[PDB]
Amino acid sequence: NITIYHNPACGTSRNTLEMIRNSGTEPTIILYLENPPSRDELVKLIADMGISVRALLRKNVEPYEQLGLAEDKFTDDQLIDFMLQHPILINRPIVVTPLGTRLCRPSEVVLDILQDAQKGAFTKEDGEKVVDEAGKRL
Numbered sequence: 159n160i161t162i163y164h165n166p167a168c169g170t171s172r173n174t175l176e177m178i179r180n181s182g183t184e185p186t187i188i189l190y191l192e193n194p195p196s197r198d199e200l201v202k203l204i205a206d207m208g209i210s211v212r213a214l215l216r217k218n219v220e221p222y223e224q225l226g227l228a229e230d231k232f233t234d235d236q237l238i239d240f241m242l243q244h245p246i247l248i249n250r251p252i253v254v255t256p257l258g259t260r261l262c263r264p265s266e267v268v269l270d271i272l273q274d275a276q277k278g279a280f281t282k283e284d285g286e287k288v289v290d291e292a293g294k295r296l
């Protein structure tokens with residue numbers, strides 16, 4: 159029972175999805191840009207991730223730039239409401255498994271919450287090796 163909030167256009171999100179598959183399960187895939195979490199779900203994701211609301215904000219996207227969000231003049235709830243009204247602000251990928259929830263940046267963070275071991279060596283799509291055939295992290 160795994161869920162990934164996935165952006166097919168992001169290498170980090172692609173590598174995370176293939177690592178999930180390499181542990182042997184096909185996750186439920188939520189294209190969050192199109193189908194963002196509800197307010198309640200997003201608050202829960204953030205609490206489970208143990209990160210600040212602002213640490214979930216993606217920089218360098220049009221609403222972050224034009225809404226001035228680099229500056230420290232927003233409460234946590236104002237930032238959650240911006241994220242819901244402009245879903246590209248939600249950084250990615252978020253992964254939920256029975257063991258917990260993480261913002262998988264970098265992608266190998268997901269190894270923390272996958273229940274089953276990678277089934278073989280895993281190399282990221284730019285050739286960065288992540289785990290060898292024996293299962294050791296490199």
Ligand SMILES: O=S([O-])[O-]
Pocket residue numbers: 216217218
């Ligand atoms: O992938 S970075 O530009 O958020």
Ligand SMILES: [Cs+]
Pocket residue numbers: 182183
């Ligand atoms: Cs499985």
Ligand SMILES: [Cs+]
Pocket residue numbers: 193194195196
């Ligand atoms: Cs939803």
Ligand SMILES: [Cs+]
Pocket residue numbers: 220
């Ligand atoms: Cs636009």
Ligand SMILES: [Cs+]
Pocket residue numbers: 269270271272273
């Ligand atoms: Cs684990």
Ligand SMILES: [Cs+]
Pocket residue numbers: 169284
């Ligand atoms: Cs890269």
